[PDB]
Design a protein around this ligand. Structure first.
Ligand SMILES: [Zn+2]
Lengths: 81, 143, 193, 129, 150, 87
RNA sequence: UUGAGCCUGGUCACCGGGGUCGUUAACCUUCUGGCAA
RNA sequence: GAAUACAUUAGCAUGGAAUAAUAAAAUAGGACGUGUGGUUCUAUUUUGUUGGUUUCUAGGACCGCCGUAAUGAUUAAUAG
RNA sequence: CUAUGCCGACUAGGGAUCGGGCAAUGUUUCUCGACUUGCUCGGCACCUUACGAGAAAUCAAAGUCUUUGGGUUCC
């Protein structure tokens, strides 16, 4: 207090702040590639998806849109990158 | 505005002191340069109109002041209204205010003038009551 | 050999581009994918520079219509270039042409697009010089006397033989833009974003 | 909405200086803000400032050292001639020896004293002392 | 500072610093461009284009891979709607409010909201006529607003 | 300040607080001086060698005196593992 | 389109003023006179 | 010796382009130029003097093509 | 009527409350809800204090105003 290093804020002090209020604003979302439980194709999905996702092969709904992070109910071994 | 047949009046619209004889066929047309760095438009050199009160192929002369303004009204015949805008000085408040004055200039058929289309005018001797300027250069938005 | 050398370089300097053409032809002697990708590949100019130590760098200008192939083709030839050039670094830069500021006495009615802007060109040069690693931050620090230094924060991906390639990158950018610059790798604590 | 960014920058700086903090974060940044700060820096009132270059207007972090009383802006940008510099100095500066008036002279952003040396007036930006 | 409300929300999207195509992606640029064209023929707004592409197909920002905005792509390839999307949505909302009012004349709150929407539409139309997106004699009449939407 | 002759003419030169670089007025009755002596091996601090700090009344009322004194001692090297510039 | 290095001459380690070269091409463009690919 | 300045609102002229504005080309309607071809006018010169025609000649302007080369759209503001 | 115009920037410590979001190898009830904790955005307010303001009552604005200038209406 009364003397801080605004150039290099702590990572913990940054992950607890709003995305806009950070020193340099950045996204908090990401994309992950999921696999159908009974198939072999891999489809990339968004963490904040607003639309019903359907796998390319014969499969049911993937995730349900919501206000925040959508919930995955299919048994997909998702890899996030 | 709209150019009609030049001989559409009671009197034969003619360039003064120009004659056609048997030796020199047809009727020659005379043109002059207004000066002050301006150039005579090509359609004035080869046109149809007469326009006795025109800086080109006419009798008026360009001398005095040269102003620039945006033409607002073209509904009247062969003349327009130029709107000059400037900022006035108030020494007390050290600030400006917007002041405008409307001019009155003559437009030849040589220049196609519409709304907007700021032009440059020059003194050309009194012409009609409040008309003392004539359009010389046009910086058109189309070109 | 068998011609196919002159068209590689637009100009004919003393020895620089001639040796560059000979080395790239020797690499292109290999058939298959390398030959196919190197067939529509050329060069414009090369410049030899020194670094603060005793290392030598070669700045090669690349034409704009070749970067699409150069992105996936230069990785397989940079190792051969540094091996053949006898311990000389190679740095590819996309050559551009910037336009004058529209001064009062000089009217330019053609307009200067933003892509041909000195600041935009400097940013594009900075992006191109650090080829493998991308930029994640940049800060302009002004000293008390008024000297301006640029701190460019890079990423921590593909650090194979680039920890001093970036130092050579700073060495070129020292005289290619007239601004002192230093690149720094941050610390990626934890796993996730 | 935001009208001038220099006024917000100077208000934040003077608030931090009065509070006694050694640093202040300024957003947004601009060329006028930068030129004002380097003029203050070459006169010794402000220490180093780092310009955080975002893909936006950009931010800046300023290191303070006290020794300034108040830095403010003069809105609107009144036109100041050479003869009016003395009147503005008497109106705004604490004295004839302490205090700096910044003018956006056609040569560039500069202090009133060196604007007098260059013999060129301009528009008044602000002041600091 | 809401234009027609007292709210002070700051909810928005913070684009990343890296203005580059995704490191792990195979969008192939032209394939996405034709994909946007296919969806445009299907008849969805550019906002829906970006939402679907981001949520389902996996491209975060289309301009990162394509090099131009999706509206620019649509205009370049010819599928450019005569009315801008924001103005079309505002006029459609005004039509819906007017229909609600004409069926139920006692909704003073709806009348007030219609006045706000009318003012917003006129301000947006003036901006578009000034910039050149619409003919200078565009105008806005409630009688022909339904035909304008349809 | 110095006149044209060159000598220093004034009643006195006020001292400036090390925590905020502001002068201390004659009636700043909350402004105190902190004196700490250095230490050698096996303790037994030698008298006569000390470092001094001045904290103004504004800082004392604001409550920043503790952290300011922590910064001053840490910068001087008298304390370890108490104050950090990165919070 | 910001900064760095010079020449020369001006009242006091200092300041204002004119030209340049490379970063990046450095009096844009026109008319006249000369040299000319 | 009978100066000099104050004056400059407003007009005229020289120098600077920081501060505050509008278009510099989108359907490229673009610097494009001892460049591949054409057409409209004028004689600023000479054919012996005015005058009438073709135009070598020198100049003003309009029509499809030729990549000269890096061919053109500022981020998207803890504004809307 | 908050006898206190609207927009925008900054400024001290804490705890309640409403709406949303994030996180918990947290609890509970036949995949969700309820409860608990922390963070954050936008509101309604509250306690202490006064770097600061006021003639004072008092005010986180009525502060950043003789160190007097962010913009704009009413009076
Ligand atoms: Zn499915």
């Amino acid at each position: 207090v009364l003397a801080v290093d605004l150039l290099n804020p702590s990572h913990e002090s940054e992950m607890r702040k709003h995305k806009l209020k950070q020193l340099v604003q950045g996204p908090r979302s990401f994309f992950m590639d999921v696999k159908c439980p009974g198939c072999f194709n891999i489809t990339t999905v968004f963490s904040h998806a607003q639309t019903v996702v359907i796998c390319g092969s014969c499969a049911s709904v993937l995730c349900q849109p919501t206000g925040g992070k959508a919930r995955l109910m299919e048994g997909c071994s998702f890899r996030r990158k | 505005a709209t150019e009609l047949v030049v001989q559409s009046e009671r009197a034969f619209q003619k360039q003064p002191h120009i004659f056609q004889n048997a030796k020199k066929g047809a009727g020659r047309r005379w043109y002059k340069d207004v000066g002050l760095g301006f150039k005579t438009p090509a359609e004035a050199i080869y046109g149809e109109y007469v326009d006795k009160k025109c800086p080109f192929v006419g009798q008026v002369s360009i001398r005095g002041r040269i102003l620039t303004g945006t033409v607002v009204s073209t509904k009247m015949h062969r003349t327009i209204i130029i709107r000059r805008e400037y900022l006035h000085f108030i020494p007390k408040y050290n600030r400006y205010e917007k002041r405008h004055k409307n001019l009155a200039a003559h437009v030849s058929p040589a220049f196609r003038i519409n709304e907007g289309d700021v032009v440059t005018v020059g003194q050309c001797r009194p012409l009609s009551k409040t008309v003392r300027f004539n359009v010389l250069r046009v910086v058109k938005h189309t070109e | 050999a068998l011609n196919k050398i002159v068209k590689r370089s637009s100009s004919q300097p003393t020895e620089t581009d001639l040796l560059v053409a000979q080395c790239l032809y020797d690499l292109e002697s290999s058939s298959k994918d390398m030959a196919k990708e190197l067939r529509p590949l050329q060069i414009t100019s090369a410049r030899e520079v020194e670094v603060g130590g005793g290392k030598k760098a070669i700045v090669v200008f690349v034409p704009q219509p070749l970067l699409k192939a150069f992105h996936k083709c230069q990785a397989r030839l940079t190792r051969e270039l540094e091996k053949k050039f006898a311990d000389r670094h190679v740095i590819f830069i996309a050559q551009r042409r910037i336009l004058p500021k529209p001064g009062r006495k000089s009217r330019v009615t053609q307009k200067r697009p933003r892509s041909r802007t000195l600041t935009a060109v400097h940013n594009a040069i900075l992006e191109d010089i650090v080829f493998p690693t991308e930029i994640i931050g940049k800060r302009t620090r002004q000293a008390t006397d008024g000297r301006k230094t640029i701190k460019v924060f890079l990423d921590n991906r593909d650090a194979n033989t680039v920890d001093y390639k970036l130092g050579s990158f700073s060495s070129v950018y020292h005289k290619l833009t007239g601004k002192n610059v230093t690149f720094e790798f941050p610390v990626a604590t934890g796993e996730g974003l | 909405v935001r009208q001038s960014v220099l006024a917000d920058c100077l208000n934040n700086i003077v608030n931090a200086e009065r509070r006694g903090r050694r640093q202040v974060l300024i957003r947004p940044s601009s060329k006028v803000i930068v030129k004002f700060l380097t003029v203050m820096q070459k006169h010794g009132y402000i220490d180093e400032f780092t310009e955080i270059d975002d893909h936006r207007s950009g931010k800046i972090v300023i290191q303070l050292n006290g020794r300034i009383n108040k830095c403010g802006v003069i809105s609107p940008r009144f036109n100041v001639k050479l003869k009016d510099i003395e009147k503005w100095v008497n109106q705004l500066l604490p004295s004839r020896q302490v205090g700096v008036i910044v003018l956006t002279t056609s040569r560039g952003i500069m202090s009133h004293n060196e604007a007098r040396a260059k013999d060129a007036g301009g528009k008044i930006l602000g002041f600091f002392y | 500072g809401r234009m027609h409300s007292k709210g002070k929300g700051i909810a928005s999207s913070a684009l990343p610093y890296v203005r580059s195509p995704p490191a792990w992606c195979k969008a192939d640029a032209d394939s996405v461009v034709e994909q946007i064209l296919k969806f445009s023929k299907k008849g969805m707004s550019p906002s829906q284009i970006g939402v679907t592409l981001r949520d389902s197909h996996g491209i975060p920002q289309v301009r990162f891979i394509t090099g131009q905005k999706i509206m620019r792509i649509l205009k370049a390839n010819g599928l450019a709607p005569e009315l801008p999307e924001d103005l079309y949505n505002l006029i459609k909302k005004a039509v819906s409010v007017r229909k609600h009012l004409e069926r139920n004349r006692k909704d003073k709150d709806s009348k007030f909201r219609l006045i706000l929407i009318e003012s917003r539409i006129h301000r947006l139309a003036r901006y578009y006529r000034k910039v050149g997106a619409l003919p200078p004699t565009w105008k806005y009449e409630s009688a022909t607003a339904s035909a304008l939407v349809a | 300040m110095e006149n044209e002759a060159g000598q220093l003419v004034d009643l006195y030169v006020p001292r400036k607080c090390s925590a905020t670089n502001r002068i201390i007025q004659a009636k700043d009755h909350a402004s105190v001086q902190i004196n700490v002596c250095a230490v050698d091996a096996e303790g037994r601090q030698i008298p006569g060698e000390k470092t001094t700090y001045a904290i103004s009344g504004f800082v004392r009322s604001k409550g920043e005196s503790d952290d300011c004194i922590n910064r001053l001692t840490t910068q001087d090297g008298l304390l370890e593992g108490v104050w950090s510039y990165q919070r």
